[PDB]
Amino acid sequence: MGSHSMRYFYTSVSRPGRGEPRFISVGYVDDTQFVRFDSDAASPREEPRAPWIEQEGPEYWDRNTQIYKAQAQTDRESLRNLRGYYNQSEAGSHTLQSMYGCDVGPDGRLLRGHDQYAYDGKDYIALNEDLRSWTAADTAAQITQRKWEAAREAEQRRAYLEGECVEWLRRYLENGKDKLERADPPKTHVTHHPISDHEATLRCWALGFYPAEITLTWQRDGEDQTQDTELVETRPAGDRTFQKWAAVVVPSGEEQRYTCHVQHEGLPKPLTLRWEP
């Protein structure tokens, strides 16, 4: 709704006896990945993954590289403290994941801030939406909560999400504006897929769209066919666009009573499309 988001996704994985945990970061604006960092690279540095972030100069890259190198060390301490809190052995591999960022509206202002964590694939601790309090998943994460409440660390997180995150996202939208503020509507069609004089699959395609959010559905004279549809989960083309299809087996001869319906932000008007014999 003219609305946008920025998110950083961190994964640290320990590998006991084999040198230090590996730290990986990726950065997204909306559904566009724009930066990465990998502590295992031969010279770890933040690197561009979209063409419009390249216009930031070498000072920007250095600064963020320093951030990531420091975060890596911080996540290693965390991993060490986590293993202790759960009374786990020193030999196993563990995963600490972080996700944080902001949602903003068309006015460019903060709608919601995010900052939360997972240990071994499960919720551990999260900053609540007031950005002034925490939710802890179990008694181990209350140990972390007590530390971070004693230090009032939510104030520093708030400052980042309200003050920094918001202005960086605006900056990136301004750098990337014809790729980030433009929706790419799905190119679409319906293929016929006969299985015999028994059946016929009408698979409906939506290809090449951005952003990823879409709705593909079928009807029988009007009626949604939720039960009798195979839907793939939406998937990357690899060129920064997305694909999806939706299929339905329809009694052989009744195909033209059925209509695929496509909704996506890149189209003024919803599509009601049919098979072309």
Binding site: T74, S78, K147, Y160
Partner: peptide, 9 residues
């Protein structure tokens, strides 16, 4: 721009 790291867990 990513956030400056805070205290460990």
């Amino acid at each position: 721009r990513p956030q400056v790291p805070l205290r460990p867990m």
